[PDB]
């Protein structure tokens, strides 16, 4: 029938990150800390070692470009690839970092000549290869901020793919999102890949901070390099949808009590339920899936303190 086991640890961090970007490489947890308060800006690659984040390398030090770039990190079996991309132009200019231990990185300046994602809003995320027809692909996906008429010629979500570990971005994945509603802002679009199945987790609101309703669309593969998505209704009355992940081919949905996240509720297959109530809140709670039956739920209850909830789940 079912199995739920939850243990939690803490992680101290002596680097005050503006934004955290967790990832699991070779079954271990790493962070992509952005340190930007003589303002030496850093894009540190930290790693969890016992109960502390250990800084391994600064990617911004080895970077020609300025400003907070777009960070796209891809975690395949035998390597990490992280891209730092200048936002503002006809061509995109990225810096491609490669590592296979988590500490050693070797950058290479890349140029996405005449990119399609121009005009589309991009944002930083961690992803994993998506296999389509005997070929894995890394995805840089963008959304159209505002829509006023239903143009078919122009698709709302656009994805450029790379089947050479991020070296050349010439493939175009066609995303067909049939529920794109008019007048409102759409932001923080990040794809969710699992079991070689594609989905997108984005926000729909009035402003990046004013209104932030979480949306989730699951896509099916219609034909060669073309996907067609539809919305997934995770709405629970008197609860705020926060993160969505999958364990055991079942959704793991995070909800808050209000938009202040004093308490979080985690639902498994909607069949089972647990409560996260930081003794501080659970704001910014995210699932960092480790395995098909194990995920992490991380939020920071203070500056420098991370709460690492480890969740084990299995259904039969």
């Amino acid at each position: 029938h079912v199995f739920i086991r939850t243990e939690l640890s803490f992680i101290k961090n002596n680097v005050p990150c503006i934004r955290d970007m967790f990832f699991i490489y070779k079954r271990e947890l790493y962070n992509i800390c952005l340190d930007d308060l003589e303002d030496e800006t850093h894009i540190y690659v930290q790693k969890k070692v016992k109960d502390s984040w250990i800084t391994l390398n600064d990617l911004f030090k080895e970077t020609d470009l300025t400003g907070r770039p777009h960070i796209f990190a891809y975690v395949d079996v035998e390597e990490i690839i992280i891209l730092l991309c200048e936002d503002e132009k006809k061509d995109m200019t990225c810096h491609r970092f490669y590592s296979n231990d988590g500490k050693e990185y070797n950058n290479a300046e890349i140029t996405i000549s005449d990119y399609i994602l121009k005009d589309k809003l991009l944002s930083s995320y961690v992803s994993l290869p998506l296999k389509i027809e005997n070929r894995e692909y890394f995805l840089i996906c963008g959304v159209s901020p505002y829509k006023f008429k239903d143009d078919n010629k122009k698709d709302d979500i656009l994805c450029m793919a790379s089947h050479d570990k991020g070296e050349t971005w010439g493939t175009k994945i066609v995303i067909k999102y049939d529920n794109y509603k008019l007048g409102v802002q759409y932001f923080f679009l990040r794809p969710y890949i699992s079991k070689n199945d594609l989905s997108f987790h984005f926000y729909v609101g009035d402003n990046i901070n004013n209104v932030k309703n979480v949306n989730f669309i699951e896509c099916t593969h219609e034909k060669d390099l073309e996907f067609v998505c539809s919305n997934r209704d995770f709405l629970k009355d008197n609860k705020v949808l926060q993160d969505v992940s999958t364990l055991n081919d079942e959704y793991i949905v995070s909800y808050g009590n209000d938009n202040n996240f004093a308490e979080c509720y985690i639902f498994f297959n909607n069949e089972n339920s647990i409560l996260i109530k930081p003794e501080a809140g659970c704001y910014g709670g995210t699932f960092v899936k480790i395995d098909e039956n194990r995920a992490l739920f991380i939020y920071s209850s203070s500056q420098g303190i991370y709460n690492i909830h480890t969740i084990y789940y299995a259904n039969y």
Partner: antibody
Amino acid sequence: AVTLDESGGGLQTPGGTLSLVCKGSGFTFSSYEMQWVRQAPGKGLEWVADICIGGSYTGYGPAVKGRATISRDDGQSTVRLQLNNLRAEDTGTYYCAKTARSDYCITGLDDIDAWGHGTEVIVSS
Amino acid sequence: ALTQPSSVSANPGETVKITCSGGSSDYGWYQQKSPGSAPVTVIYENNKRPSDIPSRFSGSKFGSTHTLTITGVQADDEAVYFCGSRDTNNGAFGAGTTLTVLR
């Protein structure tokens, strides 16, 4: 009184192995990246190896790669450099060193803030 | 490799400047009066100085260049100063600079 004391430096056999121990005091050992730096007689300073917090990462100099082995007994506050197949090129004075930043392992030699007294090794028959 | 000067010289009380052109990451300076004797950290992070080291020592990293400055040199300031940074492959040291006090 952040101090480091080296031991095991003597006249080892060419072909044999070496074992240098660096005991640290005054600072919270285990929270800082440790390193080994040698100096051949007459020649300048040379990086040997470095060990990250909790031994998570282990790096070596090209001169000693595939021969040296750095380890840490965080309880005893010691760093052991175990260099095998000793060539005459290994002769010199070895100084262990502490990185200034805690929970920080960026690959650089600009962050050393504590140097050990230095033990002399002689590879000779 | 880190390009460090072979030797530099100055009279007592005069300000001196030593450079390091090679390398990518931040720079550090360690003095060593005699070979075999342990070096002493003079500056660790680009413009950071240990509590035991006197106020006359200062750093500055302008591009790939870092200059160690000794304002008002003294007799106990004679040593072979070394440059510490990272080379293309891994962490690396400079060739060494020998400072001589003019008398």
